[PDB]
Amino acid sequence: EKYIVTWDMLQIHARKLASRLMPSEQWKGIIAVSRGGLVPGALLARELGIRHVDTVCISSYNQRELKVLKRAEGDGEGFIVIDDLVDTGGTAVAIREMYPKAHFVTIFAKPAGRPLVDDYVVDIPQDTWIEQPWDMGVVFVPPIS
Amino acid sequence: EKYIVTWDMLQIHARKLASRLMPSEQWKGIIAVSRGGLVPGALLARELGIRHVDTVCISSYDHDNQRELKVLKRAEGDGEGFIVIDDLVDTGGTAVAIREMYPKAHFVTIFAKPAGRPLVDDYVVDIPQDTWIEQPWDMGVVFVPPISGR
Amino acid sequence: EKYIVTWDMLQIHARKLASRLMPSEQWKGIIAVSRGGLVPGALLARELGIRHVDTVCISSYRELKVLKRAEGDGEGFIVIDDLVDTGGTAVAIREMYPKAHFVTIFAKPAGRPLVDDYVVDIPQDTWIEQPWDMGVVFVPPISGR
Amino acid sequence: EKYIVTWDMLQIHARKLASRLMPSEQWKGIIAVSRGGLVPGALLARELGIRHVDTVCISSYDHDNQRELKVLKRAEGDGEGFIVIDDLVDTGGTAVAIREMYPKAHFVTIFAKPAGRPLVDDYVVDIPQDTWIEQPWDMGVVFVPPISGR
Numbered sequence: 001e002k003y004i005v006t007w008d009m010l011q012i013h014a015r016k017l018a019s020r021l022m023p024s025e026q027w028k029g030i031i032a033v034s035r036g037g038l039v040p041g042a043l044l045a046r047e048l049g050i051r052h053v054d055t056v057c058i059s060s061y062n063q064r065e066l067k068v069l070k071r072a073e074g075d076g077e078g079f080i081v082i083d084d085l086v087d088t089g090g091t092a093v094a095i096r097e098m099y100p101k102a103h104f105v106t107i108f109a110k111p112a113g114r115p116l117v118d119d120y121v122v123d124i125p126q127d128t129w130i131e132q133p134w135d136m137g138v139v140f141v142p143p144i145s
Numbered sequence: 146e147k148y149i150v151t152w153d154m155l156q157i158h159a160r161k162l163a164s165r166l167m168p169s170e171q172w173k174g175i176i177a178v179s180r181g182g183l184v185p186g187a188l189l190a191r192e193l194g195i196r197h198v199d200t201v202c203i204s205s206y207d208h209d210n211q212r213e214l215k216v217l218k219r220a221e222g223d224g225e226g227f228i229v230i231d232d233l234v235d236t237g238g239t240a241v242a243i244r245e246m247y248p249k250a251h252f253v254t255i256f257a258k259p260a261g262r263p264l265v266d267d268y269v270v271d272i273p274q275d276t277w278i279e280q281p282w283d284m285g286v287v288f289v290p291p292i293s294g295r
Numbered sequence: 296e297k298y299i300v301t302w303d304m305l306q307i308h309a310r311k312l313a314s315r316l317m318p319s320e321q322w323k324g325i326i327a328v329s330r331g332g333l334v335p336g337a338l339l340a341r342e343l344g345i346r347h348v349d350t351v352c353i354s355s356y357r358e359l360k361v362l363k364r365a366e367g368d369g370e371g372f373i374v375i376d377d378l379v380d381t382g383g384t385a386v387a388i389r390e391m392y393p394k395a396h397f398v399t400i401f402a403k404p405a406g407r408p409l410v411d412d413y414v415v416d417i418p419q420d421t422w423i424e425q426p427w428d429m430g431v432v433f434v435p436p437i438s439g440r
Numbered sequence: 441e442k443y444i445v446t447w448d449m450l451q452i453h454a455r456k457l458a459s460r461l462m463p464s465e466q467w468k469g470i471i472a473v474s475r476g477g478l479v480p481g482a483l484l485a486r487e488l489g490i491r492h493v494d495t496v497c498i499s500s501y502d503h504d505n506q507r508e509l510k511v512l513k514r515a516e517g518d519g520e521g522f523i524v525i526d527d528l529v530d531t532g533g534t535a536v537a538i539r540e541m542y543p544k545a546h547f548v549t550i551f552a553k554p555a556g557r558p559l560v561d562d563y564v565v566d567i568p569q570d571t572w573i574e575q576p577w578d579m580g581v582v583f584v585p586p587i588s589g590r
């Protein structure tokens with residue numbers, strides 16, 4: 001099955017998460033995980049009024065290897081690390097390793113990667129594919145007839 | 146406790162429902178319950194290709210513990226071969242009245258709470274009794290202040 | 296080209312049109328032209344608090360035929376359609392509902408003069424893609440990089 | 441006079457911009473101007489298949505007729521082979537500052553008012569100077585009272 005997420009709904013979830021991160025004063029900045037955390041990070045920055053927004057870029061290369069293309073400085077103290085979702089937590093482990101003192105959060109969370117995040121908004125089944133807004137668009141759809 | 150329903154989601158539910166109503170040759174037309182069933186009815190008409198869309202207008206004003214119903218406009222017939230669509234069913238008060246007027250009709254809705262659930266022939270989404278459904282036509286995209294004034 | 300109309304935008308235009316039809320006490324009801332005027336008519340009914348909404352179903356075979364029609368000459372009623380291109384269907388509506396206030400959301404040059412009021416001007420060669428004919432689906436990246 | 445920009449429309453404009461930036465092999469990465477260029481930058485990154493997305497954080501403060509700029513954080517280099525993106529250009533104040541920091545970068549925006557229009561390498565929509573652009577991240581779908589109480 002597929003879970004369709006529209007921009008409106010994603011924003012509704014982002015505002016819900018933003019309220020739990022209050023007061024905003026306790027945060028020095030936001031570190032968005034490219035590319036999934038970019039949009040959610042932008043919404044939290046707007047809601048919390050945080051202007052210090054940085055990023056962390058990671059790519060993949062028998063085994064799968066994580067490659068840090070771009071890295072945000074520090075250990076994450078006073079920072080919020082955000083990604084759109086946590087499926088298995090394979091990428092979440094790398095982030096935790098780089099930013100141990102950071103408050104890692106996501107919008108969506110499947111069972112397997114759920115223990116790896118400090119907070120999330122929506123629970124999603126392990127076998128369900130979450131279709132994000134940036135991957136979709138408004139186009140013509142033929143009538144069922 | 147509120148359930149927000151955007152236009153996109155409503156359309157997705159309407160299309161789900163339309164796929165169950167196939168084929169479209171079995172339907173003479175569609176009777177939309179004004180005003181809530183107008184949009185869903187228009188969406189079914191597009192998907193099924195039904196050009197014959199009619200309406201049934203019933204107003205209702207609550208007076209303490211009783212309802213004043215009034216049929217402002219009624220579609221002729223017993224609903225034979227017609228689809229009677231409404232946006233949702235809460236207590237089932239409207240549904241009961243409709244089944245009366247159009248007994249031989251296929252009554253369907255998009256949303257259905259536990260009370261009205263047994264009164265509809267088919268629906269798409271289950272919604273709790275305590276949950277209020279916020280429809281798209283009652284909402285709008287407007288400026289919303291930040292959670293913090295930082 | 297193709298003029299894309301989303302649900303949000305269609306609703307905005309509908310609200311602008313509703314404000315011009317005020318006050319709402321001068322109206323006995325609304326007659327929606329199936330199927331284009333169904334959604335706009337539903338929005339007007341909500342904004343103007345009108346509960347009496349009827350429909351008129353016209354069909355082609357150019358030979359127009361009325362499948363179903365609302366009784367009366369349209370005195371005090373608002374006849375609405377989503378748009379007016381050439382005014383072919385509009386001319387037929389005028390004949391049926393003379394005293395009626397005919398309005399649309401969009402209007403092309405050729406059919407412009409056939410309506411009492413509209414909101415958006417659209418070129419004659421431009422195809423208006425309505426919200427009910429579209430949907431949010433996956434759209435592949437402009438590049439397979 | 442205000443110009444409403446929904447999420448869907450912003451995406452359509454972003455996709456049109458991405459088509460002109462093709463091929464994507466000529467780009468080493470994207471530098472988004474926080475916070476306005478964050479969403480547009482994310483959309484380009486998805487469309488172009490770019491993974492190296494960085495930011496430049498500039499804080500502004502109007503003190504009567506003069507502006508005080510303060511760079512909280514900035515991407516390394518002169519923007520050679522990079523795409524610097526912001527959501528819009530109003531007076532062009534931020535654009536001039538950015539262009540000085542990244543002179544070799546391809547500076548683009550989605551919207552452009554007459555005043556700042558000559559400062560961008562490429563943009564998508566022409567906006568009047570007197571028109572206020574209402575971005576999606578500042579809005580939300582909420583209940584809107586009927587225009588009449590009939």
Ligand SMILES: O=P(O)(O)OC[C@H]1C[C@H](OP(=O)(O)OP(=O)(O)O)[C@H](O)[C@@H]1O
Nearest residue numbers: 179180181232233234235236237238239
């Ligand atoms: O299950 P019930 O408790 O009977 O109520 C459900 C009705 C009432 C509500 O419409 P109204 O509140 O009547 O307003 P509107 O005419 O705008 O649809 C809704 O759209 C359904 O038609």
Ligand SMILES: O=P(O)(O)OC[C@H]1C[C@H](OP(=O)(O)OP(=O)(O)O)[C@H](O)[C@@H]1O
Nearest residue numbers: 474475476526527529530531532533534
């Ligand atoms: O052309 P100018 O007059 O210089 O202004 C245009 C700037 C400012 C505004 O952002 P800000 O108001 O700076 O806030 P934010 O950080 O949210 O983008 C907008 O997103 C552009 O980046």
Ligand SMILES: O=c1[nH]c(=O)c2nc[nH]c2[nH]1
Nearest residue numbers: 233235276277278279280
């Ligand atoms: O918009 C509405 N939402 C509801 O949940 C409901 N129940 C009754 N009437 C209703 N109207």
Ligand SMILES: O=c1[nH]c(=O)c2nc[nH]c2[nH]1
Nearest residue numbers: 528530571572573574575
């Ligand atoms: O949201 C915004 N809209 C505008 O039109 C604008 N001009 C400067 N800064 C702006 N921010």
Ligand SMILES: [Mg+2]
Nearest residue numbers: 179180181182
């Ligand atoms: Mg109703």
Ligand SMILES: [Mg+2]
Nearest residue numbers: 473474475476
């Ligand atoms: Mg800015």
